[PDB]
Amino acid sequence: NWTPDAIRALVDQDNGKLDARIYADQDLYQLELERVFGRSWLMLGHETHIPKIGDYLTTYMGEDPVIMVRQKDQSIKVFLNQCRHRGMRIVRSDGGNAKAFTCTYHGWAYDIAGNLVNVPFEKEAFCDKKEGDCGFDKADWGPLQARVETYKGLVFANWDPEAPDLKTYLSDAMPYMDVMLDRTEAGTEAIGGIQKWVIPCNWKFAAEQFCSDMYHAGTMSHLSGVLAGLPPEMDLTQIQLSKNGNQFRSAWGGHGAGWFINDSSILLSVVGPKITQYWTQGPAAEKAARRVPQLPILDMFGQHMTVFPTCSFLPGINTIRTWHPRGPNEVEVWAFVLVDADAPEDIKEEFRLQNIRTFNAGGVFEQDDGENWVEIQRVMRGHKAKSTSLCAKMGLNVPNKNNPAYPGKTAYVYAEEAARGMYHHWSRMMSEPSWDTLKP
Amino acid sequence: NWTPDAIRALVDQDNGKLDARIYADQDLYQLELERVFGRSWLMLGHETHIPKIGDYLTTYMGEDPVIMVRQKDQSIKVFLNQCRHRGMRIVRSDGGNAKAFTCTYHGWAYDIAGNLVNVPFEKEAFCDKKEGDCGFDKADWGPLQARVETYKGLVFANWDPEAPDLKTYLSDAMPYMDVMLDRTEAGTEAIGGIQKWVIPCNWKFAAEQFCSDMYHAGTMSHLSGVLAGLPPEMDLTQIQLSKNGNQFRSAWGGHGAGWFINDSSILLSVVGPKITQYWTQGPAAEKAARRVPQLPILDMFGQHMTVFPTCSFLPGINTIRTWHPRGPNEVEVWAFVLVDADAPEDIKEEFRLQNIRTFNAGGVFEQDDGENWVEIQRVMRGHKAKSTSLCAKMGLNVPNKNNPAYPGKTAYVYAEEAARGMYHHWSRMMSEPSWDTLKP
Amino acid sequence: NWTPDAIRALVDQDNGKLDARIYADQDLYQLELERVFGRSWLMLGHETHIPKIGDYLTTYMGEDPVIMVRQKDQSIKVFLNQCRHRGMRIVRSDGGNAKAFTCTYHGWAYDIAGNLVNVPFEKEAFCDKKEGDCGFDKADWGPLQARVETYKGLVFANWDPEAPDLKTYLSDAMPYMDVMLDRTEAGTEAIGGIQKWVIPCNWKFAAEQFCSDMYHAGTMSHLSGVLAGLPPEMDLTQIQLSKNGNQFRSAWGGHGAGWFINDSSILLSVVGPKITQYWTQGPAAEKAARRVPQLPILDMFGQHMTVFPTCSFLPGINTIRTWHPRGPNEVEVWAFVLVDADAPEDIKEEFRLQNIRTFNAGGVFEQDDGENWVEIQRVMRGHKAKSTSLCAKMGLNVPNKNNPAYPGKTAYVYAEEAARGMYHHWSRMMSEPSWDTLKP
Amino acid sequence: MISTPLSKEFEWPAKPVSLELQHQVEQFYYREAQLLDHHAFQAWFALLAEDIHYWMPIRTVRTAREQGLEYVPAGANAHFDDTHATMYGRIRQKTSDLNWAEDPPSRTRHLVSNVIVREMDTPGTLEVASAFLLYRSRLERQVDVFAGERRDVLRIADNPLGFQIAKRTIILDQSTVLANNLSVFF
Amino acid sequence: MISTPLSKEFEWPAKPVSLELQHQVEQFYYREAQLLDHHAFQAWFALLAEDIHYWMPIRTVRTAREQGLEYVPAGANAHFDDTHATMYGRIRQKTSDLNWAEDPPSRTRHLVSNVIVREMDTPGTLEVASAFLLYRSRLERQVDVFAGERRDVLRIADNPLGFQIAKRTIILDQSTVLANNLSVFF
Amino acid sequence: MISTPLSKEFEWPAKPVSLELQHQVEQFYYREAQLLDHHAFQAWFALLAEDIHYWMPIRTVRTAREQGLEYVPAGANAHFDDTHATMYGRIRQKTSDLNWAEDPPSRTRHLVSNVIVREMDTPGTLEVASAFLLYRSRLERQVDVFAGERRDVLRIADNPLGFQIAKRTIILDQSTVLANNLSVFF
Ligand SMILES: c1ccc(-c2ccccc2)cc1
Ligand SMILES: c1ccc(-c2ccccc2)cc1
Ligand SMILES: c1ccc(-c2ccccc2)cc1
Ligand code: FES
Ligand code: FES
Ligand code: FES
Ligand SMILES: [Fe+2]
Ligand SMILES: [Fe+2]
Ligand SMILES: [Fe+2]
């Protein structure tokens, strides 16, 4: 039994300390399902995954399987992939088009809105003279509905009716999202194929890394990944390093972003010269600069971002993923690639191939990331190692690291201000039962 | 920590509602081992599995491994397959004949009654001058004995000395059992070979299905199974359906049975024309009608039954099984086939081959059953899905569905009266600590 | 929640009874990690595993991964294999030589003493003008250090600063250790290669067996192992048995040893004639007798020993291992072979080959040991089997079984006095929070 | 020898068969595996002879003195015990799109190795022993691994594959079936 | 047939290839497996032709009516989609001693069986289907098992092994990748 | 080459061996597997030469600079290190009916593939590399999977199988042994 005071003690943003129990404790994970995943806005996919009426995608909200389906009025509804009769999975496919969703156990059929419309033998077994005259009404037995909101292509969902709306939830982080999402009036589109793989680590390691951790990329985590993109005549001794940049911590919510400034080296290593040129020079880059006027986007390179708790992406590379939790010791990565809808075909193709090369289950960057996370989780199995006080002091009390060209709280590119913000908001959601105090 | 009031709230038979937590909660499962499996009559096998003196079968009572062995006086004893010294499994074989059971660790030998009869070095190490003079007596260190009762071939066992006798425990359900068990004065016999397989689902899904769920078979669960038995010139559009029948709920105990009336279609699809003829017409069918006078057995077809908690069978098809629990998320099915001992050899052979075809780990019916159960359990892993209020309203408050030709409480063939009875008795066993109130 | 009184009730040394819950209860295991493994002296390896400066071995203290490393001053330090930043495993190799240990995630480098010496971008990100002026000091962020003590070659470690020193902890058991460890002034050396394998059983079964259980070897556990060493013309009917010997229980700590007297049969079966001759006759045997004057070592054969909780060895065969716990239902055996450093090369080779033959993952003796333990653990999964009262009465109240030629408390070779002592001390460590009462 | 106990090793001929025959049998099995692993159930069924007996006995756990009782004998309960007619029904189920155990369908791989051929007295008829590893995965994460031995009677046939399966006995290296079903062909 | 749907069985020739050719293809694959299983990545890379296309599509879970959507098509997201240049980079990573996913290196075993060869119209060019079982273990206890099918285009070459891989398409018998990465070559 | 480091790939000959020899070696291995998988331990032991050395080294987890220390060397601790005499004892144990680790006996399958043969200078003597998948199941639910490589020295012999095993070195693709024992032969 965890008390609000005991939970708050696990994270100390004022002293930059983290209790290692947050990553492995089973009781804390169960509280995460209720107090974090049960009332946060979670990314399910993109609008282009379900463009036509009846199109659906099966995905997750935490460990709960959900159906994301396009309606007749072009709206999107999200409901639990669970039959109200005995709990059978209603939809067993990854996606497609449907006029109805039928349960294979007893044949209970639901419409695309999630309403129970057909119950076999209702006249013979469920009622006497007319439907509903014996206490059974089909309107009472539909699967749990989630609140649905879209932000510039991305579909978010939330169970909690008391939770704030998506935009309020996103705080001052929206311009940083727009660097990838609002570059053109044509919007973005998802390249076909969501890659799914299983990493035995806590979701917070992955969420924090994309939130606040450029430090790993600028050190030794990706030396071999950078070398993979270098020509035969070039090696790691010839390439510089990169030390100029900033990071962002959201005013509320635990969102975070980090980027390098005036140096395309880290982007060039991942995406190559063609995308780097598209990202910086020409009509498309000029249009994007006008559409995101709150940020000097043309000077930003190799950006990382996490929308709390589990929506992570890399503007410029354009990989985007949801970390689906599978206990305190496991996560499922559901990743896809976004491109500008009006981008030239050779640019879209370049985005496609460079993503597979780099940020992919078998990618030259991604494989080294997971290996770090899996080993952390394995060490956490130890009794002394699970209660260790971890260092989150990076950048704390360090003056003159902010950047006035960027909105909100900023720090150095190599810092854990956004990380401290992520874990502070985590502790807030875990300790405060009501939105009366939790809301911004 | 679960309170009796909190446990009773999980099942509402008056409103037809079930809390999904009953199928996955680990703490509730541990209480099931003590309050349900620890004091219920559980089926271990048939008398024909152990016909001769010394013949034994290793099986389970819940998760406890037990030895079922024929005694010198032709009685049957059941005791824990655990050595009292350090807990080693005494018998490592599935079955056979023995004069003694010897532990491989330190050589402690037990007789077929479960008495410790030989302790190596007892004279040198355990006593001074005479056996027992230093506090060690072999009579004190025998494995835990279970109460043993047989009902017309089937062997049942119960740990609890305070529990009611088998026949009292069976309430008014015995005639429904006799449809399969008491057709002839020759009794039944088990065809050699107990099929064992592992299904990752809760035991209650399987127990309920055989207790009260004809609904799944009459809908879409077994459309492909029915098609498997149809000749090339016939398809599913030509075959009717079946809508006439009843189900039975026991006065006490949570036992249940369901059957179709005056329609052999569902039986014919599973067992074929030869068995259907044997089941309905001729001297054998006439004899069975005389031996079970409380039921119009000749008009009953495709019967399903569960003797609470885990003894399930299908009279007519004659598959019978115990669902051995393996946590809240897993079960082991131990199934065998029963035939009338005096049945003609071609009938016994037909029963054998039709069972393998249909109700078997690889059978055309059974495989679709498991697939439903596994998917329900997988969805239950979600936080919202595990606490869902499930619909058990089928047939509740629906008038004129009983049948006066059958003893006890009856409802429509497509109903969940027997299901509500099963879960109501489940909640009773889980909430009432004493047999002073639990007993009928 | 376990109370000190409830824990003490699990072990009754006065009546020779053990509660089976000690071997499988998850809550009791978590208390073992804190109250037993968190403050006991645990064997990590031998000094010969790390002979040179910078040489390291990665091993375990319970479930905590640790680095055992030789220092510049020839001392040995032991610290947690966990980076203080985000918990990444610092050393991923089994062993070798290092000048520094570097974390692969963010490049935090530690010296061989476990001090944090290099933090990438410390000047740019962690401080303002000088290192440490913003609250971040490298001296604050080193991995947890363990107390290190060696006993005649063997390296022991303990987390608890309040715990007694190694020699005080070893009570009156040291002479029994010297039978293997102090035979020569040259000391012992470890043959290259630590064999690691996984047994799904509780650590206490293995620890007790080597502590007090000659009974299994003298009965039927190793009949096939003995036959493996017999020539074609010989079988088990021709070989005697062995019934003369004693066992030892430590005054404090739960340490135990057992041996046969004046009979080399059990040793000859395992190690052969060449080692038996070396162990008993000649200058080496004569030297050993002088060096261990508190014991008649030349009359001792087939000795087994456990240094509580998990250090087990067999003097004469010279197999030695640590049982690393992996939950209540699993253990990892880390075994190696010790030889006298000055022993002739043909003797060292004989020790090497006979060990692989016998006490090894694939050895003729070891394989039958594990099979017993795995089956005990599997039965313990049952509800009735997990709470069984087990017999530890062997030798209790049995008079005239001691031997005055041996120091401390002694009993018959076939007895559980040392076993009762092991479990009594186990219950003491589990129920007493302070060393103020626990210390000898 | 057709009636060799399944507990006993296969009765291989004095000398191994010709290179040509070994090649033809192996290639047939590889083609058979291709059909199953790509859900060509109708094409696979065409390879089963009219007098096919498809049988997979139950294996039990026995100690030393009762090892002759390891296999549940013919004429008793089994995992599979099938004729051409019953296998036809199984195929009808598999291709119906109503077989919920196989809709969505399983992803399978039939690894075929250790092929030992024996020429029987009837011209064109062969007795063949082989080892198999059947990997089965379905839906999101379910994985079932099957291993064992197949003992077949094969006849030369005028079909494109050149052979028909007259008899198949499957030794499964399991006692308790560890998968939730046996909804795949061996 | 190069463009055969991966859901459909391999288009084997009317009659199986010669004994000699079957032997040469199998022996090449065994030698290829030896190089990978012993971390001879530079030697293995030499077997890849200059125009190599190394491709592993994503597999999805689909019901009856949308089974044609099982495989994520070419020109979309994939597990692998590689040329000679991108594979060169992968090899550079593997031999750098900075590839943390493979340092310490994985212990692998590439089991190669069910080899079916088809002779293409271009002399010396072959289309080959084979089944694989890739066992991968690393560090203390990690074990990942991969199973599936490879469809290759092989060309005769003047190298010691006699062949070069011109094209490789990998069918993996998984939808969701059950391993933490795909840091091994197929 | 007999003394090739186990970390390094097998030294295959310039050109693959004859079809006939490949067939004879493979068929021998299939017959060897049949004997083990059907617990014919006395018959299997007859295949071991009088000068047999049966050896399985311990594998360790090493980083880049100390990869030469992966294998625990000869003349040190090992999983197996056996002669004809010690193997005889192992067989005596296995057939005693008192070997509790193998009574009840394990259900095994030795999958043999990737067979590469090299003809040595001594007539009738061959060095052979092969990959294996050893599936082991026992009692109710225990399953252990072993994968790796065997490097054998085989001699032609006047026995019915035609060969005897003169040397066997087993590469096991594990560092920490994941099974509770190694109570099966490789
Ligand atoms: C988390 C994930 C990826 C990156 C990243 C790596 C290289 C280049 C650009 C961003 C930073 C944090
Ligand atoms: C549970 C299990 C099987 C059946 C059943 C299915 C078809 C025909 C007869 C009974 C009904 C409930
Ligand atoms: C525990 C482990 C091994 C032995 C042992 C067995 C045979 C010969 C000598 C000692 C006794 C207890
Ligand atoms: S479970 Fe969906 S209809 Fe019964
Ligand atoms: S455990 Fe059965 S005799 Fe010791
Ligand atoms: S985890 Fe070791 S440096 Fe960050
Ligand atoms: Fe990264
Ligand atoms: Fe059913
Ligand atoms: Fe032992």
Author numbering:
A (entry chain A), B (entry chain A), C (entry chain A): 18 to 457
D (entry chain B), E (entry chain B), F (entry chain B): 1 to 186
Give sentences copied directly from the paper behind this entry.
Biphenyl dioxygenase is the first enzyme of the Bph pathway and the major determinant of PCB degradation. The catalytic component of this enzyme is a Rieske-type oxygenase (RO), which catalyzes the highly regio- and stereoselective insertion of dioxygen into an aromatic ring, activating the latter for subsequent catabolism. BPDOB356 is a typical heterohexameric RO with αβ protomers arranged about a three-fold symmetry axis to place the Rieske Fe2S2 cluster of each α-subunit within ∼12 Å of the mononuclear Fe(II) of an adjacent α-subunit. Structure of the α-Subunit - The α-subunit of BPDOB356 has two domains: a smaller Rieske ferredoxin domain and a larger mononuclear Fe(II)-containing catalytic domain, in agreement with other characterized ROs.
